[model samples]
Target: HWGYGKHNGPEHWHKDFPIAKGERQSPVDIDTHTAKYDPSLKPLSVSYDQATSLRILNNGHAFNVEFDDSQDKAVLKGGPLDGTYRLIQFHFHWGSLDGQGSEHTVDKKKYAAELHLVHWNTKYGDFGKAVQQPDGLAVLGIFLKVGSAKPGLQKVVDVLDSIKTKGKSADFTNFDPRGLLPESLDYWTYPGSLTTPPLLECVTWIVLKEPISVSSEQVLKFRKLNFNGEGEPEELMVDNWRPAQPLKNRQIKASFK
Candidate 1:
């Protein structure tokens, strides 16, 4: 029932839903110096044609992309992990303003935004059901920073004009998100839970250290999207990021090895 608005931003999310106070949040500050860097990690192979149908939804907070039940082609090979999972929804967390957008902070550094590619274990049938199971989910976290202009993201941003009104949604067909991935797949993995409500645990988080850049103008356009009620015009909803949560007892592992 929560939509983006004044006092309803991610920073104050815990106020309405208290459980967020104790949940293990993400976008943890990643310091390569203290990190056990492993350079041999392989990228997860993703075939867009085989992936589930991308369901674009307007969730008020941000434009979220949900995967259809058919797109569950993630296969985990050797290593500590050994199983296949189903790709779920992918969404973003951004700042209300252009300077900062990432939800998790490292040493107080916040990026322009954070993209979460959520997946779940097909062994449990589907993402909805799997999300309820322990060890049922995996999320890939990619950082987005404002830099030189890039047209890749236009696929998502171009729709902003249509959904300018809060809570408004439209279908975005034939879009492949894999192109938005950073050049380097090297990542940091850890055990964590969903950043949002229900705070489900059992998620295997893969956070890409390499960040992709978007134009400063693009950042401004994103900020121009609506966060208030439907009738309200696209009133700039800058700063949608949530404060970092405690790491708890988790140990983050890097794919650098």
Candidate 2:
């Protein structure tokens, strides 16, 4: 039952996730003058581990914070990764205003939100068997512009009033997701998928080129969550993002020339 609503959104999700039309899908639309300039792309080694986070869910479609990948307390080594990759969760993709909640865009510029982080590959052994291998996941994407007020996203927007619906959860400890990064990790790799639904073409997208603030009243506290679920009929989880797929024969490298 894929959702973003409007009778099971994402254009009715290929009628039940038929790989959602396959071919390396994902939020792809970054034509930074036709991105290309990979000097063996490297420099991206995130370490995290502020007590391995742990909770902060909403799950009916986004608000995950998870972490605690059993070991490797949040790894991610080297750019187009091939070795360590642990970290497990981290989410966001908003919008109901403030330009338009992000999900990868540049020459098409739309940002008010978008913060993935995921991660998986440890030679494929977790994250449900490394999401069906293809270099097994990487995701880092971060773009949330608006301006000012971001004390590490106000510590997760002051705990969004205790999960406000859908599935609710809490207990998010220490929480140091590099304080929601963006001091310039200059990136833009590709080969993607899993923008939602079982749309897993494996993913390895890096995407990042500075963009971190978030205030329009803290994005109105992430639209006060809700996407239904507390007995249904509430629905408020904003746009939730996912639109910008086709980039056939992929290739979007660029680690800043």
Candidate 3:
């Protein structure tokens, strides 16, 4: 199965595998030519109590965590984002095949992978219900590239041995996710839909322009993930990403002021 090439490689994906019908997608040609520079656009600082540790969960789809937001310091209060939105779950999207990983495309290019910091409106009470609200969710998109070593990502890769197979997970304690944040907090903001099935169009996306780097070995480990049933070996599951979708008359804004 290793050298089966494209079509044979992902024969298990949904019948409608390519979600986007040929539109500009993510990991695009970032020209940085546009003249919009906003130095004031800073990430909202978050405060949490020392007792508030992160709860990690490997939900078969991705490794995510639930943070104790009740102790969060810098909370989002109101606007299109009303109520205190708490950090809920965070996960990633990668490619089954090489050279195609991101979900959003600027001018038709794909990155290695995309990480999402998922947050939900606390007013809704729970993640399942919060997703139904207009401003119920906000996702921070972090792009991943395969190349030079990134010290910050080591913590995550260290635990790959524990959750290497599907439906398998081990407790990841004393891990600080903030360490994964890119040096530049600058991002592109837009109103878009979920990149998965159900494809709900209610998310406020903040896609970071400065992608963090990781070793090719780290990427190779991700490729080994498989959702294949019990009979299959937990080998590489490269090309797990979705194709880019149309802009649908929507305009994307960036914090390049």
Candidate 4:
């Protein structure tokens, strides 16, 4: 069981899982200049049907908005991916309203928060099986800034009050994640592992160069949530982020220079 706590945190995860120290770890800093530019890289021609969204669950780690990935109705087609990547779920990581909390940074600068839209390759059949293959998963990472209140994100903030406790869930739908994307399809990418345990080395990381905006108040709502359920000595759910890891023998490419 890995957590952000000092005693049983990421620094100690390698003791139980050797892959935690694997070469292709994620959350790496994206150096725009040093990255290779590939003109062949296509724009992110992704599609998402509002009907695919099903529920939002607080699984004691972070609030994960799960989707119905049984079909290819909602998938990432273009960009660095070779084929279709089905949307499975999306989640976020943030610090206190005033602090930095993004998992991945650009050129040594961290954002206020980060959002991950997890997807699986169609060839893998299902998410569980997909995670084991080298090219099975593709995660789109969107950085969050502290600024104007984004009307597009209001629905997510709306449910934060009700699903504040761990294991708490709610019926969530009609929400399309595309609204959260940055204006530019420009991105940096590389092969990496899941930021969490099982630490599978199976994801193609697509991190947008530009970030979406969210107000400080919106970030504050996330801080009020907890890691555990009712009656527990509350640990405010902030700073649920993994630090950048080494990028050994890997070349990170940019869709644009």
Candidate 5:
């Protein structure tokens, strides 16, 4: 299976997924000093229904919280989007240690972690179909910093114990994801890709300017994940984040100065 291990890491991904080196690849290095500031960029519109949360699972990649997207139970609009996009799943990318693990970096600075909320345009009919076309997907990215424990994060950490092994899954519903967000909605917008296998290039990345804090203890707990299931040799699911990709000629538009 394709994984973040050095044996088959990002350096070798292009062997199978050619788009891994594409111009619009994701998780770019953000040089804020040179980024353009757009005062007219509309405020981000985010709405989620706790009832839509379906399950939280460890797919040997990362823990993901899936949502039912039948009819826009949760939707994201405004902020460089032409139409509504529905939230389908949310996941995290972290490093092997507390000091670093985020995908996108600012001025070459790394954060403790990064969270991605994956969504697809409603105009595309579904995530499967939307993922194939440019401008079909939008991933809301939030950086996680190490500081005091985030109260809302405890709920997510609580479920990790039951999903330590790969392929493990647990019930996670009625969970309001908004509690994990920072007060500010200001962000940097760019064109990017999945940052995963098949490395599809059809995403509008909205990386938040604010970072949510998570205690060191909480970050340590994340190291408990196992890439292999019980009875197999264990491999900690740490350092799963991909390095920053090439920026090409794409512009990073900041919603605020």
Candidate 6:
């Protein structure tokens, strides 16, 4: 099984999932100086419904807050997307230490963590079909730095106890993911794949230029989550982040100067 271990980590992923070496693999370094500003790029638009939020689960990889995506209650559009992308779930990738955790970096700078709001193109019908198409997905990436407590994040952190072990899930609702965004919608856009396994090259990544803050105390709670199931040996779920992949021939475009 693939995991963040000495023998089963990302370095060994290419052996099983050959697309791990694909041209458009994600978590690429965003060179701010090299990124060209596009004046035509429209502002990123997001409309989320608090009631659409469902359960929070730890899936042996990373914990995610699932959403009701049967309709367009929560959607992403107007940025680098062709049509509407329905919000399916939102998850995080973090490190054991505060210094390095984020998957995508700017100017070679890493943040304490990264948040991915995964969405699927409604034109494709379902998420399974969407994951295979070139223009099937649009993931919004938000960098998280260690600083003052963010009230939006605290709502998530509060449920860490119930889902301390892998495969555990707890009821969580009335949460609007929109509260998690920074004030500015400025971002860098590119064609990339899912940061985790199956590394499908079907994503149009929209990474925010502004990072949200998470308290050191809050991050400590995240580390307490275990990768193994209950009654198994404790393997703390930390460093669940993939290293940045090659930029290849892709050109990153910025929405702001």
TM-score (all chains, Cα) for each model: 0.84, 0.34, 0.75, 0.97, 0.98, 0.98
Looking at candidate 6, the ten consecutive residues that score lowest on lDDT are 42-51
Candidate rank order under lDDT = 6, 5, 4, 2, 1, 3
lDDT scores for all predictions? 0.68, 0.87, 0.59, 0.87, 0.90, 0.93
Question: 2 or 3: which has the higher TM-score?
Answer: 3
Summarize candidate 4's per-residue lDDT along 72-126 as a digit string, tens digits: 7788878989989999999999986555899998888888899999999999899
Residue 106 local lDDT, model 5:
94
Clashing pairs in 6: none
Per TM-score, what order, best first? 6, 5, 4, 1, 3, 2
Question: What's the C-alpha lDDT at position 230 in model 1?
Answer: 76
Q: Give lDDT tens digits, candidate 6, residues 34-110.
A: 99999999989887853399999999999999999898889999987879999999999999999999999999999
lDDT of 2: 0.87
CA displacement after TM-score superposition, residue 211 of candidate 5 (Å) = 0.3
> Candidate 3 — number of clashing residue pairs?
20
For model 5, the superposed segments whose C-alpha errors exceed 4 Å read: 49-51
Q: State the displacement of the C-alpha of residue 80, model 2, in Å, after optimal TM-score superposition.
A: 6.8
For model 1, the local distance difference test gives 0.68
Best by lDDT: 6
lDDT string, candidate 3, 215-246, tens digits: 88877777665654345655465555556554
Q: In candidate 5, what are the lDDT values of residues 1-257, reduced to their tens digit?
A: 57888888888899899889898998899999988999889999998753288899999889999888898788999999999999999999888887789999999999989999999999989999999999999999999999999998888888999998888899998878887889899999999999989889999999999999999988888888887787789999998888999899899999988
- Candidate that beats the other on TM-score, 1 or 3, i.e. the better one: 1
The lowest-lDDT stretch of 10 consecutive residues in candidate 3 is 19-28
Candidate 6 local lDDT, residue 140: 97
On lDDT, the stronger of 1 and 6 is: 6
